[PDB]
């Protein structure tokens, strides 16, 4: 987030970090329940990659993070790599997340759900703060 | 890339108003937000765009793409969860 603010620890429970086996965070994600994580199809998530929940400070070794293994990657077959449309992939966890004060699920809208322009929302993650 | 989790408030735009910036690259399963002074950037992808509905934080978008320079005047593009929740419900049921 370029021009964002530091979040309050534990305040965005569903936010998870996707990292390869090198430790590198490439994408973010969201826990929709204890065994499923939603991320972007363009992220290119394999099963060599790991889901990390309960994290705030990536450089803090004292944190009680949860390193979750991916069982299967369910890419949306209506995903278009050329237009980058229908950019959503589900990740079935081989090991279920333990929900706590810091690890939990965000709510999913109804297909019928309505979100008007001019409405203020929130985005989170560990992406570049400057370019 | 920051060590700790960041956050940013930003408004939802209309696709029509967003096509003014991105034209025909904006498709039906995409929803824009930004041009407000903040911008999602590389590494934020896959991440959540949440709005409160009935006092509960609900998934409205997935950090997808935008400005190569993460320009805070240019709207970011997120995957429209409203259009993609049917497939998710179908997938979780069957697996």
């Amino acid at each position: 987030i370029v021009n964002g603010e530091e979040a309050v620890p534990g305040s965005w429970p569903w936010q998870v970090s996707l990292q390869d086996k090198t430790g590198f965070h490439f994408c973010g994600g969201s826990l929709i329940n204890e065994n499923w994580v939603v991320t972007a199809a363009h992220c290119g998530v394999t099963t060599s990659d790991v889901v990390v929940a309960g994290e705030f400070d990536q450089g803090s070794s004292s944190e009680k993070i949860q390193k979750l293994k991916i069982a299967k990657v369910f890419k949306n077959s209506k995903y278009n790599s050329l237009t980058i449309n229908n950019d959503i992939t589900l990740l079935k966890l081989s090991t279920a997340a333990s929900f706590s004060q810091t690890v939990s699920a965000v709510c999913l809208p109804s297909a019928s759900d309505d979100f008007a322009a001019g409405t203020t929302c929130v985005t989170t993650g560990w992406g570049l703060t400057r370019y | 890339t920051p060590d700790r989790l960041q956050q940013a408030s930003l408004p939802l735009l209309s696709n029509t108003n967003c096509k003014k910036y991105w034209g025909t690259k904006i498709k039906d399963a995409m929803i824009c937000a930004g041009a407000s002074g903040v911008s999602s950037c590389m590494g934020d992808s896959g991440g959540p765009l949440v709005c409160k509905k009935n006092g509960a934080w609900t998934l409205v978008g997935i950090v997808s793409w935008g400005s190569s320079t993460c320009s805070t005047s240019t709207p970011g593009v997120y995957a429209r969860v409203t259009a993609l929740v049917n497939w998710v419900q179908q997938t979780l049921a069957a697996n």
Binding site: G10, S11, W12, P13, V106 | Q7, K52, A56, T58
Partner: peptide
């Protein structure tokens, strides 16, 4: 869902 134990501050 949608209601964190630790509350956000914007």
């Amino acid at each position: 869902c949608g209601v964190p134990a630790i509350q956000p501050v914007l």
